[PDB]
Amino acid sequence: KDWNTVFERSINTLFLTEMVRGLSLTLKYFFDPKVTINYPFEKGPLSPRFRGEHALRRYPTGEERCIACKLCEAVCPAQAITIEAEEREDGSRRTTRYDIDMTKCIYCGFCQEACPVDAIVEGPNFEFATETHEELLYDKEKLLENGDRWETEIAENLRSESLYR
Amino acid sequence: MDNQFIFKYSWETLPKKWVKKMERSEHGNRFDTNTDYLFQLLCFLKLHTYTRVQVLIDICGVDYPSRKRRFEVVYNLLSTRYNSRIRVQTSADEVTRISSVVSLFPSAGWWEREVWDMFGVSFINHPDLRRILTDYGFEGHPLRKDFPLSGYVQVRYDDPEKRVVSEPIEMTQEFRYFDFA
Amino acid sequence: SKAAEFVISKVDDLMNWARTGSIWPMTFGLACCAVEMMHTGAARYDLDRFGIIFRPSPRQSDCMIVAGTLTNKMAPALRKVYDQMPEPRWVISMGSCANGGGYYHYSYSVVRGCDRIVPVDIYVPGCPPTAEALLYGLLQLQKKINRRKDFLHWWNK
Amino acid sequence: NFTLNFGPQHPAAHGVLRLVLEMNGEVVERAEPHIGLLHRGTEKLIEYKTYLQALPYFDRLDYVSMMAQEHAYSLAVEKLLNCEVPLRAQYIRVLFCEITRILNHLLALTTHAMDVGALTPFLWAFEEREKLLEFYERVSGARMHASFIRPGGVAQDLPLGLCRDIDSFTQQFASRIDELEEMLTGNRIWKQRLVDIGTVTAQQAKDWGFSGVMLRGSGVCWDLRRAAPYDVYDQLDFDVPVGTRGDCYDRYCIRIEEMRQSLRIIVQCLNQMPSGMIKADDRKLCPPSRCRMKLSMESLIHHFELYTEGFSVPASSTYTAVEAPKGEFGVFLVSNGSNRPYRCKIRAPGFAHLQGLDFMSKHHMLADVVTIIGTQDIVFGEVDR
Amino acid sequence: SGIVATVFGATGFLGRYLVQQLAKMGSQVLVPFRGSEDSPRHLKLMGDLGQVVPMKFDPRDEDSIKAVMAKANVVINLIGREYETRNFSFEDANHHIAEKLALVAKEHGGIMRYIQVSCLGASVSSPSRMLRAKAAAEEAVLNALPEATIMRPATMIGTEDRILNPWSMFVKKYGFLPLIGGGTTKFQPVYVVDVAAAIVAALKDDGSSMGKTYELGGPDVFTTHELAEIMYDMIREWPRYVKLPFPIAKAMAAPRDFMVNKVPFPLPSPQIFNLDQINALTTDTLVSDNALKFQDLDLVPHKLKGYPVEFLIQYR
Amino acid sequence: IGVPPNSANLTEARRRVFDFFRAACRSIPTIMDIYNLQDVVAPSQLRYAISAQIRNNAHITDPKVIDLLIFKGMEELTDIVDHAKQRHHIIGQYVVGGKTDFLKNFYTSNYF
Amino acid sequence: MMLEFAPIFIYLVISLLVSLILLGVPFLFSRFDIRFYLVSILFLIFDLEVTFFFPWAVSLNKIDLFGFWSMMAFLFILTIGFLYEWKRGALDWE
Amino acid sequence: MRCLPDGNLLQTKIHNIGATLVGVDKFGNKYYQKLGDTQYGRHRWVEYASKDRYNASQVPAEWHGWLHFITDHTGDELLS
Amino acid sequence: YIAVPAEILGIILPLLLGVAFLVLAERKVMAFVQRRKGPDVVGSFGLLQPLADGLKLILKEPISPSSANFFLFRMAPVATFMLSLVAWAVVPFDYGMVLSDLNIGLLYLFAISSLGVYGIIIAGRSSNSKYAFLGALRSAAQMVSYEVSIGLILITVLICVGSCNLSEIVMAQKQIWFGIPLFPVLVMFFISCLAETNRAPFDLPEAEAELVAGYNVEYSSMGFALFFLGEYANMILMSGLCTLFFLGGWLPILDLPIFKKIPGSIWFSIKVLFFLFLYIWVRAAFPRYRYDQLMGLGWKVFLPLSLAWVVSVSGLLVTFQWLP
Numbered sequence A: 001k002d003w004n005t006v007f008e009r010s011i012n013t014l015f016l017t018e019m020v021r022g023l024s025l026t027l028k029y030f031f032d033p034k035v036t037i038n039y040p041f042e043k044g045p046l047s048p049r050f051r052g053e054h055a056l057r058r059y060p061t062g063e064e065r066c067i068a069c070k071l072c073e074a075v076c077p078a079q080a081i082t083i084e085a086e087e088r089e090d091g092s093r094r095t096t097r098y099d100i101d102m103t104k105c106i107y108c109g110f111c112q113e114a115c116p117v118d119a120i121v122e123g124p125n126f127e128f129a130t131e132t133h134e135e136l137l138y139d140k141e142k143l144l145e146n147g148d149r150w151e152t153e154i155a156e157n158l159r160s161e162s163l164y165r
Numbered sequence B: 001m002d003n004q005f006i007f008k009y010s011w012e013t014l015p016k017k018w019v020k021k022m023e024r025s026e027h028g029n030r031f032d033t034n035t036d037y038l039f040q041l042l043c044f045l046k047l048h049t050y051t052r053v054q055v056l057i058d059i060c061g062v063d064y065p066s067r068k069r070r071f072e073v074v075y076n077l078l079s080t081r082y083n084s085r086i087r088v089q090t091s092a093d094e095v096t097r098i099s100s101v102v103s104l105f106p107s108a109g110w111w112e113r114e115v116w117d118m119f120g121v122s123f124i125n126h127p128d129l130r131r132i133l134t135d136y137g138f139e140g141h142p143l144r145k146d147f148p149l150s151g152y153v154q155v156r157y158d159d160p161e162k163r164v165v166s167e168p169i170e171m172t173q174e175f176r177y178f179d180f181a
Numbered sequence C: 001s002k003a004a005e006f007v008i009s010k011v012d013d014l015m016n017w018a019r020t021g022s023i024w025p026m027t028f029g030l031a032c033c034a035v036e037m038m039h040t041g042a043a044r045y046d047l048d049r050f051g052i053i054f055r056p057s058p059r060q061s062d063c064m065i066v067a068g069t070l071t072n073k074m075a076p077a078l079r080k081v082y083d084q085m086p087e088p089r090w091v092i093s094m095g096s097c098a099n100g101g102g103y104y105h106y107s108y109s110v111v112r113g114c115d116r117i118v119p120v121d122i123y124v125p126g127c128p129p130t131a132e133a134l135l136y137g138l139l140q141l142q143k144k145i146n147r148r149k150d151f152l153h154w155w156n157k
Numbered sequence D: 001n002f003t004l005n006f007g008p009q010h011p012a013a014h015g016v017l018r019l020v021l022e023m024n025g026e027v028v029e030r031a032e033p034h035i036g037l038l039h040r041g042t043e044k045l046i047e048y049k050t051y052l053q054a055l056p057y058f059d060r061l062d063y064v065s066m067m068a069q070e071h072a073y074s075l076a077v078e079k080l081l082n083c084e085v086p087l088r089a090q091y092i093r094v095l096f097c098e099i100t101r102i103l104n105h106l107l108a109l110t111t112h113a114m115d116v117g118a119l120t121p122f123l124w125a126f127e128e129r130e131k132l133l134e135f136y137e138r139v140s141g142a143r144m145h146a147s148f149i150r151p152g153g154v155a156q157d158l159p160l161g162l163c164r165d166i167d168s169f170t171q172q173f174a175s176r177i178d179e180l181e182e183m184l185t186g187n188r189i190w191k192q193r194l195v196d197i198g199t200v201t202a203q204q205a206k207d208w209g210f211s212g213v214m215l216r217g218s219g220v221c222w223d224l225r226r227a228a229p230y231d232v233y234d235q236l237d238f239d240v241p242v243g244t245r246g247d248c249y250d251r252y253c254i255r256i257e258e259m260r261q262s263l264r265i266i267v268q269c270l271n272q273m274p275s276g277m278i279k280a281d282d283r284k285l286c287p288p289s290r291c292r293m294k295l296s297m298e299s300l301i302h303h304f305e306l307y308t309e310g311f312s313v314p315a316s317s318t319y320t321a322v323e324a325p326k327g328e329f330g331v332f333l334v335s336n337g338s339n340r341p342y343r344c345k346i347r348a349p350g351f352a353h354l355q356g357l358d359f360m361s362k363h364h365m366l367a368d369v370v371t372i373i374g375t376q377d378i379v380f381g382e383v384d385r
Numbered sequence E: 001s002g003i004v005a006t007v008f009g010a011t012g013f014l015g016r017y018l019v020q021q022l023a024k025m026g027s028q029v030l031v032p033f034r035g036s037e038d039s040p041r042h043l044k045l046m047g048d049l050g051q052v053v054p055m056k057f058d059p060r061d062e063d064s065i066k067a068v069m070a071k072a073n074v075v076i077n078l079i080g081r082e083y084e085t086r087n088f089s090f091e092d093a094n095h096h097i098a099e100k101l102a103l104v105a106k107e108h109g110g111i112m113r114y115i116q117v118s119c120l121g122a123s124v125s126s127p128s129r130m131l132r133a134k135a136a137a138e139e140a141v142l143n144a145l146p147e148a149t150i151m152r153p154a155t156m157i158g159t160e161d162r163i164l165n166p167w168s169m170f171v172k173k174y175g176f177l178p179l180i181g182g183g184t185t186k187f188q189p190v191y192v193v194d195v196a197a198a199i200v201a202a203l204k205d206d207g208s209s210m211g212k213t214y215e216l217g218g219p220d221v222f223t224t225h226e227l228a229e230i231m232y233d234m235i236r237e238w239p240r241y242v243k244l245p246f247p248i249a250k251a252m253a254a255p256r257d258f259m260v261n262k263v264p265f266p267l268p269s270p271q272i273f274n275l276d277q278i279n280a281l282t283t284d285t286l287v288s289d290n291a292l293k294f295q296d297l298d299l300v301p302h303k304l305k306g307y308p309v310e311f312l313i314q315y316r
Numbered sequence F: 001i002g003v004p005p006n007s008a009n010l011t012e013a014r015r016r017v018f019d020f021f022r023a024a025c026r027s028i029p030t031i032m033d034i035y036n037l038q039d040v041v042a043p044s045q046l047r048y049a050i051s052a053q054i055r056n057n058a059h060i061t062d063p064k065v066i067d068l069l070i071f072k073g074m075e076e077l078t079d080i081v082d083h084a085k086q087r088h089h090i091i092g093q094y095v096v097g098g099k100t101d102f103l104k105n106f107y108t109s110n111y112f
Numbered sequence G: 001m002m003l004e005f006a007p008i009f010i011y012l013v014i015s016l017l018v019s020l021i022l023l024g025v026p027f028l029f030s031r032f033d034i035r036f037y038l039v040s041i042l043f044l045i046f047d048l049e050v051t052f053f054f055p056w057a058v059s060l061n062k063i064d065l066f067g068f069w070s071m072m073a074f075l076f077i078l079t080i081g082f083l084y085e086w087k088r089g090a091l092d093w094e
Numbered sequence H: 001m002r003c004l005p006d007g008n009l010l011q012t013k014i015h016n017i018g019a020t021l022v023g024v025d026k027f028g029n030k031y032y033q034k035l036g037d038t039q040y041g042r043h044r045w046v047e048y049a050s051k052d053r054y055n056a057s058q059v060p061a062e063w064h065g066w067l068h069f070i071t072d073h074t075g076d077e078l079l080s
Numbered sequence I: 001y002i003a004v005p006a007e008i009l010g011i012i013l014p015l016l017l018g019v020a021f022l023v024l025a026e027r028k029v030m031a032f033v034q035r036r037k038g039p040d041v042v043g044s045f046g047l048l049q050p051l052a053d054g055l056k057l058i059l060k061e062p063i064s065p066s067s068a069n070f071f072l073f074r075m076a077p078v079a080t081f082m083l084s085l086v087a088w089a090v091v092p093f094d095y096g097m098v099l100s101d102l103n104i105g106l107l108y109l110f111a112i113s114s115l116g117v118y119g120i121i122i123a124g125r126s127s128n129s130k131y132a133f134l135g136a137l138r139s140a141a142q143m144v145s146y147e148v149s150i151g152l153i154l155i156t157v158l159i160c161v162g163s164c165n166l167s168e169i170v171m172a173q174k175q176i177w178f179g180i181p182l183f184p185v186l187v188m189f190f191i192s193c194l195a196e197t198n199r200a201p202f203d204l205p206e207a208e209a210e211l212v213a214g215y216n217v218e219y220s221s222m223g224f225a226l227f228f229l230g231e232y233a234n235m236i237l238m239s240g241l242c243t244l245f246f247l248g249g250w251l252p253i254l255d256l257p258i259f260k261k262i263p264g265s266i267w268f269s270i271k272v273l274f275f276l277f278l279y280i281w282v283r284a285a286f287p288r289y290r291y292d293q294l295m296g297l298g299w300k301v302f303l304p305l306s307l308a309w310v311v312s313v314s315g316l317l318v319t320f321q322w323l324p
């Protein structure tokens, strides 16, 4: 088309001019600070809505909140909840069995939405990997231990989230 | 090109013996046809100047066990030329082969394989009609209503044979059917 | 044997240090869990910094991460790949699908847990587990590797 | 001809990808994908679920574009119910759909680039992906499978401060796109790997049911957000990029431009976001507030009903489609009047696109097969269901 | 089934087949192991969740033994070794542990069925010291538990056997296969699956198997030369047998036996030139006509050709 | 190649049956090699099993049912040959290689 | 002098020993493509070209103009061959 | 001396330089913050009491929310 | 001669350490470009990572698949590793710092380079795997293709120097480094070195995700480690050769007393480090060519340019009588 433009195209092809810009901006990131988190001393951010390990809660008196209404069992998309219930010795409507198969569960939070007494929740814990499949078959006593261990954070998160739900 | 024009023009122009039922609704314009006219109807809709239905969006089966022809095969189609959608349906049973439309829409190839895999409906002149989704050697057609949700067989590693093998199913906790009706 | 046991324990500590410091997983990226696994290997969590390098061939791998749903059609492929892994080797089951079939448990086409096909060392719960949850699972694997006493068991055999 | 059986049992190339290729030397004569390795019986499972319990299945189909499939299913249910969604919920839905589109395009572009040997853009893009995952987690409590978009609107309102953080992200995202582009767009090796690879004519794209970028790359101006608009897309300014060559390079450029237009849409949604309800007010189909259910009988009864039996959908059938990041994602829903779907057929664009691999890869080199797979943007959760 | 079985020595050859069959019948299987936790890993896939439970124990420790046995009503012992290590002699591995297990089962009190697995040629007047210790252990277990059941399988054949695999390895590495006794000794080799099935059947009966010893031999009688030929038909290779007379074979098997109890470090296990097995090759080991065969357990053993030797495909 | 139209009558359906039987029998040596059956079962027993399967359906009079049975048989043969799932005494759906039945069933369980 | 080659031999022996140690310590605990033939032929030709270049390169100070032009003629013949290969498509791997 | 073999602990010791001690929990874990902007102002971390055998599960519930930026309340304020 | 083995070990052992840490440096630089950290847990700043990886490899069970080429399969990595090692016998690090002062050293290096192809070919063929065989054939063809351009560039330097002695080649650059007048030749040499070492953007064996299996895919434990170590040692060697031929080896940048204070081995090391950094940087910056594209580049671009530079340099030096 023209000697100047043909020359400029030839030089650019021969001298790899466009390859230089990639090298340069790769080198620019070399000196910038890194985004890596120093786990486990440092952690990623999470929200009060985070759906982690389920837990069963009690009233401050020590009484269980769960009244075996079986709504969570009905709504559970994965059929991971198994409940048995009967009249307790004092006449209370209470679970004798409350199992969640942590390997069926999809961690959707539907059970927490369905529960009319804030008994079952997905708490903030996400670090509960195990060495056996049987340790992931949570029974009622394990869920209540989870609730006792995480109660203060769960209550704080519930106070925060009560203004949206 | 709105759904009032398509309904009226198709009534005026299509050969009468092709369409048994015509529905006009906000849920979609719908044409029902006998199996022996499905191919010609689709070719007409694709080629005709005032329809130009060039895209076959999908083919799917629906099982109706209470019907003599239990399967209903649904063709969802699109005209990018006229920005319109058309649904064409025909019924079928377990042994009656229906015409393939691969020669009209190459996209039909896999959708037909899927209908055969899931429901057991066969397609005449389909170049390569074999199962596409299920495991090799699968028996039955899983989307039929009478096919059980968990099926009939499961697999596990068998150390004595040094291989994965199939056995009749055994469920630790059976699927619980909650009848809220 | 007041001197042999000390040297043996030192040898075993060295072996465990080497094996925990260089874990080369092969990823079986089956479904959504593979995306969180990709995030674990990305810049924010940087599995490289723990010595964890992902390998393409089972022949250069020490660990298999099963990340996603395992179908009946895929199970023979998973088992064959596991059988090509040289010893010592470990398996991490990631996510509900790999753990016990998850949302697909009752399906006609799904293996109800990859531990029906291969022995599993660590189960990482979640659907999907967060990238940090996978990192925690890998640290649990290190903990398990650090109980090995291969040299001591062989000396006594 | 020899036969190379290629299955990458790792997410480098999908993970359940299985290809039988017939080769004449290094030239591909025929490519035959073998699928079903992730077929999990989703469509059968859905028939055993209430309409609410079925919703999480849609997060797990194209599990890189979670909220888009949520949106499509909600729209189909809304259509059959004749349910009116509040405007604020509409805006939140569109905002999250465009965030999802950016999440999908970043993953697709950079996984393709890593496949053809460019390692750095993947890390750069996945940091931005992490920021967007944080918005998902802040609204739903999940990084990926939010189950946030629902029939009638969205599960919960936005937490205070979220819009400001999204605005902060938008203020810098264009520079990130520019960095990705300078890494790839003008580089002679990148052009040599993508120019005139996997050429598709408009007639071929129509014949094989192509949609989305796979169709617009061939010069066909077609975008469901404009052709069949939904939610508040008709109140928003954005351009529809179309290709002129129909090859892999055009589709890469289209995806970059689509990210830019998605950024534009997000900015508009942030500025036009109105106040008001985020759930449809019809008290037969939406959960009451926690305080209402603890205070009012009618509310308690409705909560009990909704979480046990679920709502009913009058007998009907319809096809509903949206412009998902990967193309036209459709649901053919059949209702019989009960509380469970009678039939739910899922129309995945990847199914059409992967079927096209044979004609796209004909007479190309072996190394171009991965390039063509990357330009198709295949996720087998939606291909196999 | 409500059977809880503690199977000692289940990390070896026969153990995997036995555990698979016991899990099929619904029994709960406890698997004591002495070393690495990865030794019972292959057994965890067998059976349902919680059905197979590996447990660390120590042989030379009575507390651990009753600990792994504390929950069971059935005890099966498979522990043995055909060679020697500086830590465990023939009598230590094949007689002392078995007697200790029987004594702990007696002090347990709850063991309904006790199965001790022996070898076919087990006798007091045996050339093989391992067989002599096996006979002694048989007598010791019977004296400690007169109601115990004894199994005497012949050389077992299978994927992880220690006869056909070493032969194939030696041939593929050298090109020829030695014959220690001119390839004339007779023996009735047996599919390992059949041995597992016989153990299961004796565990399942109405009580008729208690107190009795069963001689489990394969359907057919072979010479070592005749078996070496099934190996060559199956490994698709050209046979080349070399006669190694007994004194020469004993000479080449003398160093390990000599220096095993002298050098203070472990030695590799013998494959073909094990002195005790060579001594055993001097006499023929056949199922006695007066014994209890696979019949009287209502079982028909499988013939070797085909499926029992299909693992030999891997060597082609 | 393509799926043929339904047989118009029993004669052409019988012809398709004979073609399928020939194709199934001719694939017996490939199956024997793939499953290593030389020392497990004779090839004629495979032929006999195929023919017995054909004979057990000899009462069918509808050509469409015959065509469907032939199509299914072809698919099963293809999966057996192309995508073999080796077990031991079993290929696909066939097992290869003084008291009445009531008493045995009663001793077994309460569900006959 | 050839004296300097002896360390190379001892170096080879030591490198071999290191190789054996490293490799042996873990034992203690039907589609003919003509284009490959063609690339082999081209490599052979240019290998001989480099071979003939070496003495020429060290001898340029003594052979002067005559040697320069004789090598130029050699290269002209070989480059005509190269042009023939280029035109015929021997250098295209597509 | 744990810094030499454990590089993970070394990074925490380096980044502790100039940090502010926020509190100590019942296990002796120490909590630090910087109040800068490098990871978008996220500068909270924990120094575990056990310099070997530290594990993420050792963070108690009262401090777990603070560490993960779930809440701005420290473990002490939650306990009160 | 009794002390010769000590000198040989003083070469080989620090070289193996340098390779072990080159792997770590590659990981670190790649990470830092990618805004991450790379190894920093195993040892302080990740400095113990290479020892851990090597220990893991030696403690890994070898596989040795049931092939009919049992001897060849294990000997191929030995061959490539030994060839990578033995090139260093003639490399001078400073004046008089060289094991073998070969007068024919340039041709010796060319011969070693030409021998390098056999390990890859034999690994591909002996592994009994069509994918490994095809990948090995392609890699071998690429290496022989770029060897032609490497040889012609060698001839250009030889014309300038008039001796095949590497130390003489260095000392001939006292007046000016050859990389200044022959800068395009140096660029060509570096690219050809990338292609010859199967490095990005020419790393076909690394393209598993592109359906291109590498020649070492069937290898495990220390055979695979031997292949890896030979490759990285060859990268260090190519950097050293670039330094020797064009950047004046051990010479200082300027002939001044301030620069002559610091030893020549340090100058040589710094230049080698620059070239290794460029290796890593290039791998971080660009995608990879297809096989056919890189073969076309080898035969259609680099060979004609190398031959043209030979002709131009020789003609110019003959014309003005500037020959050595």
Ligand SMILES: CCCCCCCCCCCCCCCCCC(=O)O[C@@H](COC(=O)CCCCCCCCCCCCCCC)COP(=O)(O)OC[C@H](O)CO
Residues within 6 Å of the ligand: G062, G063, G064, G065, G066, G067, G069, G070, G072, G073, G075, G076, G079, I311
């Ligand atoms: C890829 C590059 C292609 C280059 C192709 C172009 C050049 C090809 C060679 C053509 C022949 C020479 C053309 C150059 C003309 C200038 C020649 C010249 O300058 O004369 C010199 C003399 O040049 C020559 O005579 C050399 C001629 C080269 C031989 C070319 C072969 C021609 C035919 C040979 C017949 C033999 C049979 C051929 C066998 C195949 C004067 O030198 P002198 O006499 O002063 O002293 C001699 C010298 O300095 C001391 O050693």
Ligand SMILES: CCCCCCCCCCCCCCCCCCCC(=O)O[C@H](COC(=O)CCCCCCCCCCCCCC)COP(=O)(O)OCCN
Residues within 6 Å of the ligand: A012, A013, A014, A015, A016, A019, D188, I184, I185, I186, I187, I188, I190, I191, I201, I282, I286, I297, I301, I305
């Ligand atoms: C102190 C710093 C020292 C640094 C030393 C090393 C320098 C860095 C080297 C590495 C740079 C990045 C390497 C990655 C790029 C590899 C890809 C190369 C592709 C390639 O060769 O393309 C060819 C052109 O380049 C070429 O041809 C390359 C050779 C160029 C030689 C120049 C020849 C003429 C120069 C003018 C001389 C005139 C004066 C003398 C009279 C043409 O192929 P293509 O297919 O890519 O085409 C498309 C053109 N857009």
Ligand SMILES: NC(=O)C1=CN([C@@H]2O[C@H](COP(=O)(O)OP(=O)(O)OC[C@H]3O[C@@H](n4cnc5c(N)ncnc54)[C@H](OP(=O)(O)O)[C@@H]3O)[C@@H](O)[C@H]2O)C=CC1
Residues within 6 Å of the ligand: C157, E008, E009, E010, E011, E012, E013, E014, E015, E034, E035, E039, E059, E078, E079, E080, E081, E082, E088, E092, E093, E097, E117, E118, E119, E120, E152, E153, E154, E155, E156, E162
């Ligand atoms: N051809 C054959 O295989 C024949 C074998 N037998 C006998 O049948 C039994 C089972 O045979 P097989 O499975 O092949 O045997 P293996 O040698 O394969 O397995 C022996 C088992 O006993 C364990 N064991 C060995 N020595 C000791 C010890 N000192 N302390 C604790 N446990 C120990 C082994 O444990 P670990 O893995 O930890 O070492 C392993 O679990 C043995 O009694 C054997 O002698 C009978 C006739 C022939």
Ligand code: SF4
Residues within 6 Å of the ligand: A072, A075, A076, A077, A078, A079, A080, A081, A100, A104, A105, A106, A107, A108, A109, A110, A111, A112, A122
């Ligand atoms: S999180 Fe969802 S799937 Fe899991 S138990 Fe709760 S409701 Fe069921």
Ligand code: SF4
Residues within 6 Å of the ligand: A065, A066, A067, A068, A069, A070, A071, A072, A073, A083, A114, A115, A116, A117, A118, A119, A120
């Ligand atoms: S946890 Fe809640 S929803 Fe579930 S049974 Fe108890 S009270 Fe009912």
Ligand code: SF4
Residues within 6 Å of the ligand: C031, C032, C033, C034, C067, C068, C069, C094, C095, C096, C097, C098, C102, C103, C126, C127, C128, C129, D060, D063
């Ligand atoms: S566990 Fe959940 S996220 Fe993981 S693959 Fe299964 S459905 Fe997807």
